[PDB]
Symmetry: C3
Subunit: 171 residues, 3 copies
């Protein structure tokens, strides 16, 4: 019957003018790392920025990875709305996307940096929720990467999440 | 069948002369945040100081909150022995207590800082266990706030806990 | 159906050339402290060093402890392959081992530092896996302490673990 188990990170954000920082910190310490992550996003991104609903869970590899690593990633992990994998450089800058279907057609020794999809777009974290939902919905993608204003890949948004956003903005 | 799951934070305190700090730290890292909190209190407050049995779980709001926030706090959280809410300033200094019964009689736009109970007492963390138990038992309160020697609200003690303390000091 | 719940700390190590540090850090933050410990060992010790398979779970006391503490440790904790307890100085340097059977024959007021077993060996963390397994198997011990190159007791290896290592190095 616990207290901090009864408050969401969103509650904390919404009540940031009224709760002592001490209380917020004890709440954060008692929550899951996933919930702390949600709090940091809500704290950085306002209610109509897609950054706020970004999911850090994703398939990502550095620009040193090969087809062999990508194939193994897709085979070893089960993830909702996933059929792409994101490539970053050593400063975490998003470089591009490789697709599952294409990467099972290449040789395993091939660097992923040489097989980046020509179609691949990323959302900026400041994109509006409805522009985000449109961008995923009217494409052939089931997820899109999200980058911050420094170019760093911070996470992804899924087609499933876009559906929620839309249905929210009806109700 | 785990080891650090078999040792309480109290065990660690009691054995602080005999366990390497390295062992204590690994134990603390493996425990829940609630258990780490218990350890810090036992580490700071000796066996006959009420600080040691202080509960950080409480209804608290800053002096910027209104009746509207207080009403919503009481309605959204279920907490043992709770019918008061504590107001602190921006340096976390305890200012006073508002009671549930009174705050459901005021207008929601009213600042809590203007409705502090005249009756409201706080225990100092160094109060003896039996003086603490008496103070809660022979009052009309079911909980009291505890402050440190800097004036900061560090937590509360409940009527239920006081009962335990008493029954302990019989046995 | 979570992602970081699907990757072991060993996976992370094996894929350290290919995952962004950002991804590794989020994975580590989401895992248990035990799993983070496993990662630090794999990160420090290579595949044929016993340090890598060291268990931090152990009975250890400082050189200020008495027989009374040791007796109580053995009686209050259930631990796999355990019938020894390790004594360290205040800088965590391994000094020696006391055995359960012997310490139940001494007076409780006696300092453990005066009852160190003459037989007691420790493995260096760089010992090969098969030399480690041999050392435990062909002795009268069911566990051995492991020390780092600074002399610090970092953990233990059990007879059970040695069996695994052997059976691994067959298959
Ligand atoms: Cl691989
Ligand atoms: Cl695998
Ligand atoms: Cl409110
Ligand atoms: Cl609510
Ligand atoms: Cl003892
Ligand atoms: Cl005990």
């Amino acid at each position: 019957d616990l207290l901090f188990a009864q408050l969401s990170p969103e509650d904390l954000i919404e009540w940031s003018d009224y709760l002592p920082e001490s209380f917020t910190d004890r709440a954060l310490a008692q929550m899951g790392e996933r919930q702390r992550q949600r709090f940091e996003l809500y704290d950085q991104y306002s209610e109509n920025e897609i950054g706020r609903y970004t999911d850090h869970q994703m398939l990502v590899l550095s620009d040193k990875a090969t087809v062999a690593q990508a194939q193994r990633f897709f085979r070893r992990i089960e993830l909702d709305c996933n059929d792409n994998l994101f490539i970053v450089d050593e400063a975490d800058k998003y470089l591009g996307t490789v697709r599952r279907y294409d990467i099972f057609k290449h040789e395993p020794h091939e660097p992923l940096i040489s097989l980046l999809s020509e179609d691949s777009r990323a959302l900026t974290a400041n994109t509006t929720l409805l522009d985000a939902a449109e961008a995923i919905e009217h494409s052939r993608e089931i997820e899109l990467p999200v980058i911050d204003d420094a170019g760093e890949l911070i996470g992804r948004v899924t087609l499933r999440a876009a559906t929620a956003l839309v249905r929210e903005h009806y109700e």
